[PDB]
Amino acid sequence: FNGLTVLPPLLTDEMIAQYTSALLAGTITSGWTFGAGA
Amino acid sequence: LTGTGVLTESNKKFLPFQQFGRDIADTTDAVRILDITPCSFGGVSVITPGTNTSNQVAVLYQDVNCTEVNVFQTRAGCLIGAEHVNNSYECDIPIGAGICASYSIIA
Amino acid sequence: QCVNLTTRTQLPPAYTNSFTRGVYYPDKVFRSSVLHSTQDLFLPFFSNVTWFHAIHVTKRFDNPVLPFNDGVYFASTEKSNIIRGWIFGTTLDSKTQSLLIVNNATNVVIKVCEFQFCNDPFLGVYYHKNNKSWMESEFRVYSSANNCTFEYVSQPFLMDLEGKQGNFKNLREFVFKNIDGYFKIYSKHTPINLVRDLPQGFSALEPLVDLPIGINITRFQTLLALHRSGDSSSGWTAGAAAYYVGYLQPRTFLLKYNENGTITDAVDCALDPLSETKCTLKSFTVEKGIYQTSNFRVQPTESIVRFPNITNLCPFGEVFNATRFASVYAWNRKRISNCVADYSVLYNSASFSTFKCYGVSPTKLNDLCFTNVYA
Amino acid sequence: ASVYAWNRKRISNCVADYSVLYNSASFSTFKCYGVSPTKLNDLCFTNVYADSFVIRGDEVRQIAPGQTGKIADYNYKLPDDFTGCVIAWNSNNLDSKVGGNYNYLYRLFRKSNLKPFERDISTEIYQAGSTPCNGVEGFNCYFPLQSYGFQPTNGVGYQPYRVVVLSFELLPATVCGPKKSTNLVKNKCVNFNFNGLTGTGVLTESNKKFLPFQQFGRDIADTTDAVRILDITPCSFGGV
Amino acid sequence: QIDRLITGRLQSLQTYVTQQLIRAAEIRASANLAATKMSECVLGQSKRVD
Amino acid sequence: QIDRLITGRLQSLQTYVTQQLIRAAEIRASANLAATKMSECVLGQSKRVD
Amino acid sequence: QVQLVETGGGLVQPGGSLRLSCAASGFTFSSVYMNWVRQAPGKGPEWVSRISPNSGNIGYTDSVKGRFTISRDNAKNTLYLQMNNLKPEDTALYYCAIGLNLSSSSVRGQGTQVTVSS
Amino acid sequence: DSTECSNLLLQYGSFCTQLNRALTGIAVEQDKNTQEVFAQVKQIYKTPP
Ligand SMILES: *[C@@H]1O[C@H](CO)[C@@H](O[C@@H]2O[C@H](CO)[C@@H](O)[C@H](O)[C@H]2NC(C)=O)[C@H](O)[C@H]1NC(C)=O
Ligand SMILES: *[C@@H]1O[C@H](CO)[C@@H](O[C@@H]2O[C@H](CO)[C@@H](O)[C@H](O)[C@H]2NC(C)=O)[C@H](O)[C@H]1NC(C)=O
Ligand SMILES: *[C@@H]1O[C@H](CO)[C@@H](O[C@@H]2O[C@H](CO)[C@@H](O)[C@H](O)[C@H]2NC(C)=O)[C@H](O)[C@H]1NC(C)=O
Ligand SMILES: *[C@@H]1O[C@H](CO)[C@@H](O[C@@H]2O[C@H](CO)[C@@H](O)[C@H](O)[C@H]2NC(C)=O)[C@H](O)[C@H]1NC(C)=O
Ligand SMILES: *[C@@H]1O[C@H](CO)[C@@H](O)[C@H](O)[C@H]1NC(C)=O
Ligand SMILES: *[C@@H]1O[C@H](CO)[C@@H](O)[C@H](O)[C@H]1NC(C)=O
Ligand SMILES: *[C@@H]1O[C@H](CO)[C@@H](O)[C@H](O)[C@H]1NC(C)=O
Ligand SMILES: *[C@@H]1O[C@H](CO)[C@@H](O)[C@H](O)[C@H]1NC(C)=O
Ligand SMILES: *[C@@H]1O[C@H](CO)[C@@H](O)[C@H](O)[C@H]1NC(C)=O
Ligand SMILES: *[C@@H]1O[C@H](CO)[C@@H](O)[C@H](O)[C@H]1NC(C)=O
Ligand SMILES: *[C@@H]1O[C@H](CO)[C@@H](O)[C@H](O)[C@H]1NC(C)=O
Ligand SMILES: *[C@@H]1O[C@H](CO)[C@@H](O)[C@H](O)[C@H]1NC(C)=O
């Protein structure tokens, strides 16, 4: 109220959770190969 | 006591001996009883595709629900001058809360 | 003697858009290759300026008296020198000082005096068919000049006075400001090949003169020349010419100075959000992105006061006009509350040698509220 | 002139020697704001504004920036950032006569405080009441001017004092005091005083074009770079 | 008086901004470490002890 | 008046030096990362992922 | 700079009504009225008479009823004080002040000494 | 919301622009931190049913 405001992060918690889910699924299905390419 | 703001009916309970009412920061919040709210304010940002490309721009009013003031609502405020589409591309110009804009200007 | 002009059909006023016009050098300090931000009275970009004609084809001899709020940008597209000067003042009735800047066929005259200007000031050029010759003949501007303060006359010269055939071939831009008791005139002259509507482009107005007159100007009028070759009020021709009047406002501009030290482009800083972001980034080109430019705020609408109901005037009579007061070591003390204190009368009593107010101003004390007053 | 009609004169295109005024010792007050009294001989200005009037001695204090008082508010108000100097000198022997010298008049009542250097010559009768008296002074409407009525035997506070306020504004130099000019020297770190603009550096012939209306050119940081054309350069300095 | 207040509040705001800059540098170091952990521990098997 | 000017200019210089130090720390972190990359990837083959 | 130039009053013998003129300049007169005031050596000023601009009522102290009158003219913008049965005790300074209800230590002119010479 | 104080501080210098720039830099840095940490993979993989 005194000029102090909080901006929202670009990546919502939903999208961060989606990123973590993608990483975890890739790790389970492929292990380390998905980080070196396909 | 001079000030500027919006006076509203208050649900707070002032005892007979109380005149002013202060919240945190020791700034007056109610006066004998009417609650005081600062007039709607916020930031104003301009989203532009670059004067090299075009002079068309969009205006983002931050932390403002512009039902008060191509209007589109977003968690970061509201964006005017950008067409909201249901597609999803890579983020070109980041606005906030997962909304991005690119170049007419689309959000 | 001046005679009111007739044979002039009345038409509604016209308006035109001024595109990037009314820019002048704010200060006489040389700057080169720099983008400078200056807050001063400028003509907003893409503004609306009143358009006045002088065409025979009605005869449309328009020269209305206009207000003078904070300055004026005066453009003129002409090919026969129809306009010749201006008058500035508050009444134009010899009651107070009035300024006149005329350019007759022989000299440039500047006067600051009390004139009883009539309702149709003007000049008149008579063309002789016997021999091709145009020379100013009629000077019908004022009726009297009693107390004259400032005088100036340039060295003699002789104009063309000839009405040329073709489109407008000269553009004269002026800016007049009444600031700090000075009358500042900025000017520029440009060539033109154009018919109407104020050619686009950009050009800065260099300072022309700064007349130290120190008067109160609120209104002005233009003085122009008619052509003759019927009655004095009916036997006259207008001659093609156009002029445009715009009003200045306090604005912040971003001016680009060339390496020659001349202004070549500008940003209004408030015309568009793009202009505002250019202004805040201090650049004439901005790359793609989101820039936090300004702050949205809602201004107050009304003003309300909620002082107490009490109407009992505070009893300062026994505190000031009382016959006897105690000694300094036994200074008398009195309590004032639950009353309405009118401090204006006390301040305006004029009988007080010293009224030294500490912590609060002597004035502005009539709208404050206190729990107590000790006298 | 009377205070309510304090008379203001313009001074330009001359040389003003303030040393004689400073050392005259005939002035009761020589209070200079923004300029040291013994510092104007090297300086100079665009013009000088001499506002002359007469007041009471006790009222000399009211003639000062940011000072609140009847005269300072409704007769002659100086700006808060006033630059100049106020001179006040007693004229009892030349202005006081037996029987009361009422020739001096001062306006007292006005609706609003005067703006800086704002002279008010309005003769309207002050309206102190809701009912207008249509110019016929009466109840709750009074004439806003009062007479000093100086007497030869009046006290110092009531003795007359003639006051001249010299105001200066710096926006080319016209009136410059008694300082002897010197021949220009180039390509050497020297102290220079161009029309009261003081500095130190090397002056060289310059190729930049000044328009006839320009005097000095300033680069970034508001430090003068060129002066009427001469280029100013900070002479060599560095670290050791 | 307003100048006194302005000096005080500018000092407070500058102190806040400086502390925030230092804290942001610390958080950036932590975020770089977290990115390294994601690259090595998650997207692969790390041979680095502990 | 010189006291006023010195206060202002010294405050400005202190501010500039403060952000200069913070930026220098950031650049030092980047330079340490660059030296680590040079050692572990130019002078050898790195098994660290990404 | 309003100047309350007042005509001088010479010595006049008893038996003839005396007229004393009083003029002013630098301000409008038809809107503001003037008051005649009598000051004497050895004692303070004494308010003598007043006249209104519109109503034109000549009001003066009871102790002076029937021997003093005023006549104002806006065309020439001045006042004339007429006094009959003038006596030596009328030795006085008859000055003018800008007319006000209070008429106390207000603006006033330098006046002229006028005495009836027996 | 005080014009007098606004004039006083703009006469005091240009510290507000510096502070705003610093805070904006911090904010963009936070966004970059999150992006670098989490957005290493450019493809969203789905665990099998
Ligand atoms: C032009 O017209 C105006 C009014 O339209 C005339 O103004 C009159 O001037 C005379 C003295 O010059 C005054 O007595 C009148 O009262 C004015 N009229 C009004 C309505 O105020 C003016 O005289 C005319 N000039 C001419 C015919 O040459
Ligand atoms: C510039 O100002 C003129 C002032 O007349 C504007 O014209 C008027 O605009 C209002 C509404 O904006 C209308 O109600 C009036 O009828 C207009 N006047 C006339 C004579 O038609 C004009 O719109 C403004 N803008 C421009 C670009 O000219
Ligand atoms: C243009 O105006 C100037 C100045 O008002 C006139 O010059 C004056 O002319 C009169 C009459 O010939 C002389 O008595 C003055 O001595 C002149 N003053 C100067 C030259 O400073 C000039 O005559 C006007 N021209 C016309 C055509 O009317
Ligand atoms: C300049 O003159 C104008 C008159 O046109 C003044 O404005 C008037 O001021 C008086 C106060 O003396 C008011 O009673 C009027 O109502 C005003 N009229 C208008 C149309 O504004 C103005 O105050 C003068 N300004 C200066 C600085 O002298
Ligand atoms: C915009 O960018 C392109 C890049 O290829 C360039 O060719 C073009 O000249 C630019 N336009 C302007 C107006 O600068
Ligand atoms: C904005 O206000 C409208 C009604 O005024 C409301 O329906 C809407 O939910 C508000 N927006 C948000 C984000 O809450
Ligand atoms: C497309 O987007 C609009 C909002 O811009 C929305 O109202 C509409 O429902 C969307 N279309 C769908 C969901 O099919
Ligand atoms: C010839 O021209 C002169 C001015 O140059 C003019 O005064 C004269 O009247 C003209 N000839 C005739 C016959 O009018
Ligand atoms: C103004 O004009 C009048 C009448 O012409 C004159 O008496 C007076 O002196 C003039 N004012 C001056 C010269 O200051
Ligand atoms: C002045 O500007 C012109 C462009 O109109 C340019 O050709 C010229 O070089 C400039 N002056 C100098 C000294 O370069
Ligand atoms: C103040 O006076 C008004 C008028 O009589 C009255 O309506 C109002 O109730 C009063 N305020 C109180 C009693 O607080
Ligand atoms: C004292 O009496 C005078 C004359 O009646 C009056 O003007 C003044 O206001 C009184 N004092 C106060 C404090 O009101």
Residue numbers in the entry:
A (entry chain A): 855 to 892
B (entry chain C): 546 to 577, 584 to 620, 641 to 674, 691 to 694
C (entry chain C): 14 to 70, 76 to 247, 252 to 397
D (entry chain B): 348 to 518, 521 to 577, 584 to 595
E (entry chain A), F (entry chain C): 992 to 1041
G (entry chain E): 3 to 120
H (entry chain A): 745 to 793
Task: Quote the paper.
To understand the structural basis underlying the potent neutralization of SARS-CoV-2 we performed a cryo-EM structure determination of the prefusion-stabilized spike ectodomain in complex with Ty1. The cryo-EM reconstruction reaches an overall resolution of 2.9 Å (0.143 FSC) with strong variation of estimated local resolution from high resolution in the core of the spike trimer to relatively low resolution in the top of the spike. Nevertheless, this reconstruction clearly shows that the spike retains only one main conformation with one RBD ‘up’ and two RBDs ‘down’. Importantly, all three RBDs are decorated in their upper parts with a Ty1 nanobody. The nanobodies retain a similar binding orientation to the RBD whether the RBD is found in the ‘up’ or ‘down’ conformation and each has a solvent-excluded surface area of ~860 Å2, which is in line with the strong affinity observed in the biophysical-interaction studies. Primary interactions with the RBD are through the CDRs. Specifically, CDR1 interacts primarily with RBD T470 and V483-E484, and CDR3 interacts primarily with RBD Y449, F490, and Q493. Interestingly, CDR2 does not form any major interactions with the RBD, instead it stabilizes the conformation of CDR1 in the RBD bound mode and thereby acts indirectly to potentiate the Ty1–RBD binding. Since ACE2 can only be bound by an RBD in the ‘up’ conformation, the cryo-EM reconstruction clearly shows that ACE2 binding is sterically hindered from two sides. Specifically, ACE2 binding is blocked both by the Ty1 nanobody bound to the RBD in the ‘up’ conformation and the neighboring RBD in the ‘down’ conformation.
